[PDB]
mmCIF file with all atom_site columns, C-alpha atoms in Angstrom:
data_model
loop_
_atom_site.group_PDB
_atom_site.id
_atom_site.type_symbol
_atom_site.label_atom_id
_atom_site.label_alt_id
_atom_site.label_comp_id
_atom_site.label_asym_id
_atom_site.label_entity_id
_atom_site.label_seq_id
_atom_site.pdbx_PDB_ins_code
_atom_site.Cartn_x
_atom_site.Cartn_y
_atom_site.Cartn_z
_atom_site.occupancy
_atom_site.B_iso_or_equiv
_atom_site.pdbx_formal_charge
_atom_site.auth_seq_id
_atom_site.auth_comp_id
_atom_site.auth_asym_id
_atom_site.auth_atom_id
_atom_site.pdbx_PDB_model_num
ATOM 1   C CA . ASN A 1 1  ? 21.231  -54.728 30.351  1.00 0.00 ? 80  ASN A CA 1
ATOM 2   C CA . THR A 1 2  ? 17.711  -54.481 28.939  1.00 0.00 ? 81  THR A CA 1
ATOM 3   C CA . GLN A 1 3  ? 17.050  -51.285 30.907  1.00 0.00 ? 82  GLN A CA 1
ATOM 4   C CA . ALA A 1 4  ? 19.917  -49.482 29.167  1.00 0.00 ? 83  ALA A CA 1
ATOM 5   C CA . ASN A 1 5  ? 18.802  -50.500 25.673  1.00 0.00 ? 84  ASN A CA 1
ATOM 6   C CA . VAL A 1 6  ? 15.201  -49.399 26.276  1.00 0.00 ? 85  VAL A CA 1
ATOM 7   C CA . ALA A 1 7  ? 16.536  -46.038 27.470  1.00 0.00 ? 86  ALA A CA 1
ATOM 8   C CA . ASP A 1 8  ? 18.307  -45.767 24.109  1.00 0.00 ? 87  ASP A CA 1
ATOM 9   C CA . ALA A 1 9  ? 15.088  -46.462 22.216  1.00 0.00 ? 88  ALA A CA 1
ATOM 10  C CA . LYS A 1 10 ? 13.029  -44.055 24.320  1.00 0.00 ? 89  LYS A CA 1
ATOM 11  C CA . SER A 1 11 ? 15.418  -41.103 23.952  1.00 0.00 ? 90  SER A CA 1
ATOM 12  C CA . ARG A 1 12 ? 15.521  -41.230 20.141  1.00 0.00 ? 91  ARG A CA 1
ATOM 13  C CA . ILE A 1 13 ? 11.764  -40.598 20.097  1.00 0.00 ? 92  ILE A CA 1
ATOM 14  C CA . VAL A 1 14 ? 11.103  -37.912 22.724  1.00 0.00 ? 93  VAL A CA 1
ATOM 15  C CA . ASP A 1 15 ? 14.443  -36.135 23.233  1.00 0.00 ? 94  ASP A CA 1
ATOM 16  C CA . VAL A 1 16 ? 15.748  -33.141 21.298  1.00 0.00 ? 95  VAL A CA 1
ATOM 17  C CA . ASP A 1 17 ? 19.079  -32.915 19.497  1.00 0.00 ? 96  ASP A CA 1
ATOM 18  C CA . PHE A 1 18 ? 20.626  -29.600 20.493  1.00 0.00 ? 97  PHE A CA 1
ATOM 19  C CA . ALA A 1 19 ? 22.612  -29.446 17.251  1.00 0.00 ? 98  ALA A CA 1
ATOM 20  C CA . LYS A 1 20 ? 19.326  -29.577 15.351  1.00 0.00 ? 99  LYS A CA 1
ATOM 21  C CA . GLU A 1 21 ? 17.500  -27.252 17.744  1.00 0.00 ? 100 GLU A CA 1
ATOM 22  C CA . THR A 1 22 ? 20.177  -24.578 18.167  1.00 0.00 ? 101 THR A CA 1
ATOM 23  C CA . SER A 1 23 ? 20.479  -24.092 14.408  1.00 0.00 ? 102 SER A CA 1
ATOM 24  C CA . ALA A 1 24 ? 16.710  -23.661 14.088  1.00 0.00 ? 103 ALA A CA 1
ATOM 25  C CA . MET A 1 25 ? 16.582  -21.167 16.966  1.00 0.00 ? 104 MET A CA 1
ATOM 26  C CA . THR A 1 26 ? 19.289  -18.999 15.413  1.00 0.00 ? 105 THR A CA 1
ATOM 27  C CA . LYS A 1 27 ? 17.613  -19.636 12.062  1.00 0.00 ? 106 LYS A CA 1
ATOM 28  C CA . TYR A 1 28 ? 14.384  -17.877 13.110  1.00 0.00 ? 107 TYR A CA 1
ATOM 29  C CA . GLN A 1 29 ? 16.068  -15.019 14.993  1.00 0.00 ? 108 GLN A CA 1
ATOM 30  C CA . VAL A 1 30 ? 17.396  -13.634 11.710  1.00 0.00 ? 109 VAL A CA 1
ATOM 31  C CA . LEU A 1 31 ? 13.992  -14.037 10.057  1.00 0.00 ? 110 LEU A CA 1
ATOM 32  C CA . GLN A 1 32 ? 12.362  -12.036 12.861  1.00 0.00 ? 111 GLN A CA 1
ATOM 33  C CA . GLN A 1 33 ? 14.618  -9.007  12.397  1.00 0.00 ? 112 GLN A CA 1
ATOM 34  C CA . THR A 1 34 ? 14.208  -9.311  8.631   1.00 0.00 ? 113 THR A CA 1
ATOM 35  C CA . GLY A 1 35 ? 10.433  -9.442  9.034   1.00 0.00 ? 114 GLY A CA 1
ATOM 36  C CA . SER A 1 36 ? 10.320  -6.421  11.337  1.00 0.00 ? 115 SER A CA 1
ATOM 37  C CA . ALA A 1 37 ? 12.331  -4.208  8.977   1.00 0.00 ? 116 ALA A CA 1
ATOM 38  C CA . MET A 1 38 ? 10.215  -5.251  5.989   1.00 0.00 ? 117 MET A CA 1
ATOM 39  C CA . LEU A 1 39 ? 6.949   -4.618  7.837   1.00 0.00 ? 118 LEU A CA 1
ATOM 40  C CA . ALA A 1 40 ? 7.995   -1.204  9.162   1.00 0.00 ? 119 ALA A CA 1
ATOM 41  C CA . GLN A 1 41 ? 9.141   -0.094  5.714   1.00 0.00 ? 120 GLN A CA 1
ATOM 42  C CA . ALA A 1 42 ? 6.056   -1.508  3.988   1.00 0.00 ? 121 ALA A CA 1
ATOM 43  C CA . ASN A 1 43 ? 3.826   0.501   6.330   1.00 0.00 ? 122 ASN A CA 1
ATOM 44  C CA . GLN A 1 44 ? 4.978   3.836   4.870   1.00 0.00 ? 123 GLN A CA 1
ATOM 45  C CA . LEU A 1 45 ? 4.230   2.856   1.259   1.00 0.00 ? 124 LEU A CA 1
ATOM 46  C CA . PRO A 1 46 ? 0.969   4.897   1.159   1.00 0.00 ? 125 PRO A CA 1
ATOM 47  C CA . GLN A 1 47 ? 2.877   8.128   1.873   1.00 0.00 ? 126 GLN A CA 1
ATOM 48  C CA . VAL A 1 48 ? 3.535   8.364   -1.874  1.00 0.00 ? 127 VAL A CA 1
ATOM 49  C CA . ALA A 1 49 ? -0.044  9.644   -2.193  1.00 0.00 ? 128 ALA A CA 1
ATOM 50  C CA . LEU A 1 50 ? 0.955   12.799  -0.290  1.00 0.00 ? 129 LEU A CA 1
ATOM 51  C CA . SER A 1 51 ? 3.531   13.698  -2.946  1.00 0.00 ? 130 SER A CA 1
ATOM 52  C CA . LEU A 1 52 ? 0.853   14.110  -5.641  1.00 0.00 ? 131 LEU A CA 1
ATOM 53  C CA . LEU A 1 53 ? -0.599  17.237  -4.045  1.00 0.00 ? 132 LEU A CA 1
ATOM 54  C CA . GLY A 1 54 ? -2.578  15.810  -1.130  1.00 0.00 ? 133 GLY A CA 1
ATOM 55  C CA . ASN B 1 1  ? -4.021  -16.084 2.617   1.00 0.00 ? 144 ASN B CA 1
ATOM 56  C CA . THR B 1 2  ? -7.516  -15.853 1.142   1.00 0.00 ? 145 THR B CA 1
ATOM 57  C CA . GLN B 1 3  ? -8.240  -12.683 3.130   1.00 0.00 ? 146 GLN B CA 1
ATOM 58  C CA . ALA B 1 4  ? -5.358  -10.837 1.462   1.00 0.00 ? 147 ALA B CA 1
ATOM 59  C CA . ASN B 1 5  ? -6.398  -11.829 -2.063  1.00 0.00 ? 148 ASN B CA 1
ATOM 60  C CA . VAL B 1 6  ? -10.020 -10.764 -1.515  1.00 0.00 ? 149 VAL B CA 1
ATOM 61  C CA . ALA B 1 7  ? -8.736  -7.406  -0.264  1.00 0.00 ? 150 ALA B CA 1
ATOM 62  C CA . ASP B 1 8  ? -6.905  -7.085  -3.588  1.00 0.00 ? 151 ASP B CA 1
ATOM 63  C CA . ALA B 1 9  ? -10.083 -7.789  -5.548  1.00 0.00 ? 152 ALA B CA 1
ATOM 64  C CA . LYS B 1 10 ? -12.200 -5.419  -3.459  1.00 0.00 ? 153 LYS B CA 1
ATOM 65  C CA . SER B 1 11 ? -9.831  -2.445  -3.752  1.00 0.00 ? 154 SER B CA 1
ATOM 66  C CA . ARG B 1 12 ? -9.656  -2.532  -7.561  1.00 0.00 ? 155 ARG B CA 1
ATOM 67  C CA . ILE B 1 13 ? -13.417 -1.931  -7.669  1.00 0.00 ? 156 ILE B CA 1
ATOM 68  C CA . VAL B 1 14 ? -14.149 0.722   -5.027  1.00 0.00 ? 157 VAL B CA 1
ATOM 69  C CA . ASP B 1 15 ? -10.836 2.522   -4.440  1.00 0.00 ? 158 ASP B CA 1
ATOM 70  C CA . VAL B 1 16 ? -9.520  5.547   -6.320  1.00 0.00 ? 159 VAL B CA 1
ATOM 71  C CA . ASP B 1 17 ? -6.159  5.818   -8.057  1.00 0.00 ? 160 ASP B CA 1
ATOM 72  C CA . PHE B 1 18 ? -4.659  9.137   -6.999  1.00 0.00 ? 161 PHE B CA 1
ATOM 73  C CA . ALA B 1 19 ? -2.614  9.340   -10.202 1.00 0.00 ? 162 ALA B CA 1
ATOM 74  C CA . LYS B 1 20 ? -5.863  9.201   -12.164 1.00 0.00 ? 163 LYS B CA 1
ATOM 75  C CA . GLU B 1 21 ? -7.753  11.485  -9.782  1.00 0.00 ? 164 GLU B CA 1
ATOM 76  C CA . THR B 1 22 ? -5.107  14.178  -9.284  1.00 0.00 ? 165 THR B CA 1
ATOM 77  C CA . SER B 1 23 ? -4.740  14.705  -13.031 1.00 0.00 ? 166 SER B CA 1
ATOM 78  C CA . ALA B 1 24 ? -8.506  15.106  -13.416 1.00 0.00 ? 167 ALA B CA 1
ATOM 79  C CA . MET B 1 25 ? -8.709  17.570  -10.516 1.00 0.00 ? 168 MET B CA 1
ATOM 80  C CA . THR B 1 26 ? -5.991  19.777  -11.997 1.00 0.00 ? 169 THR B CA 1
ATOM 81  C CA . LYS B 1 27 ? -7.601  19.160  -15.385 1.00 0.00 ? 170 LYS B CA 1
ATOM 82  C CA . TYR B 1 28 ? -10.863 20.880  -14.380 1.00 0.00 ? 171 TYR B CA 1
ATOM 83  C CA . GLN B 1 29 ? -9.239  23.734  -12.438 1.00 0.00 ? 172 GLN B CA 1
ATOM 84  C CA . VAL B 1 30 ? -7.863  25.162  -15.682 1.00 0.00 ? 173 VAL B CA 1
ATOM 85  C CA . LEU B 1 31 ? -11.232 24.749  -17.401 1.00 0.00 ? 174 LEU B CA 1
ATOM 86  C CA . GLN B 1 32 ? -12.930 26.707  -14.607 1.00 0.00 ? 175 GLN B CA 1
ATOM 87  C CA . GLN B 1 33 ? -10.692 29.759  -15.000 1.00 0.00 ? 176 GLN B CA 1
ATOM 88  C CA . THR B 1 34 ? -11.030 29.490  -18.774 1.00 0.00 ? 177 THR B CA 1
ATOM 89  C CA . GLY B 1 35 ? -14.811 29.322  -18.443 1.00 0.00 ? 178 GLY B CA 1
ATOM 90  C CA . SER B 1 36 ? -14.992 32.320  -16.113 1.00 0.00 ? 179 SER B CA 1
ATOM 91  C CA . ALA B 1 37 ? -12.958 34.574  -18.414 1.00 0.00 ? 180 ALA B CA 1
ATOM 92  C CA . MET B 1 38 ? -15.008 33.542  -21.450 1.00 0.00 ? 181 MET B CA 1
ATOM 93  C CA . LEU B 1 39 ? -18.313 34.130  -19.657 1.00 0.00 ? 182 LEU B CA 1
ATOM 94  C CA . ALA B 1 40 ? -17.322 37.538  -18.278 1.00 0.00 ? 183 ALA B CA 1
ATOM 95  C CA . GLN B 1 41 ? -16.121 38.692  -21.694 1.00 0.00 ? 184 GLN B CA 1
ATOM 96  C CA . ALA B 1 42 ? -19.161 37.271  -23.491 1.00 0.00 ? 185 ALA B CA 1
ATOM 97  C CA . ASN B 1 43 ? -21.452 39.238  -21.171 1.00 0.00 ? 186 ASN B CA 1
ATOM 98  C CA . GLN B 1 44 ? -20.301 42.596  -22.577 1.00 0.00 ? 187 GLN B CA 1
ATOM 99  C CA . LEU B 1 45 ? -20.974 41.647  -26.210 1.00 0.00 ? 188 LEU B CA 1
ATOM 100 C CA . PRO B 1 46 ? -24.250 43.662  -26.350 1.00 0.00 ? 189 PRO B CA 1
ATOM 101 C CA . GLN B 1 47 ? -22.383 46.901  -25.569 1.00 0.00 ? 190 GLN B CA 1
ATOM 102 C CA . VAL B 1 48 ? -21.658 47.181  -29.301 1.00 0.00 ? 191 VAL B CA 1
ATOM 103 C CA . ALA B 1 49 ? -25.241 48.434  -29.673 1.00 0.00 ? 192 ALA B CA 1
ATOM 104 C CA . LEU B 1 50 ? -24.305 51.578  -27.721 1.00 0.00 ? 193 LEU B CA 1
ATOM 105 C CA . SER B 1 51 ? -21.688 52.525  -30.319 1.00 0.00 ? 194 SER B CA 1
ATOM 106 C CA . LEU B 1 52 ? -24.319 52.941  -33.059 1.00 0.00 ? 195 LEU B CA 1
ATOM 107 C CA . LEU B 1 53 ? -25.828 56.041  -31.459 1.00 0.00 ? 196 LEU B CA 1
ATOM 108 C CA . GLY B 1 54 ? -27.848 54.567  -28.596 1.00 0.00 ? 197 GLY B CA 1
#
């Protein structure tokens, strides 16, 4: 009996909850694609200087 | 974070603004052609002396 209850206590501390973890993993995937598009588009900001005659 | 803000401060001091610089560059180009025409025409002022019989 006591072995089962200690296993309960030990899992709440070191084990992951997939419901919590899966949401976070999908959460950051969107942020990565958002970050890549923003960075690529922000890199060509200085090309405005070429419009004003070199 | 602090690296980005120092880059802001450093660029305002040493970097040019092309909007400011391009206007000045075009500003002086006109003055050069104006100056050249005035100088060439002012050089032949003394030819009036030839009209009064040498």
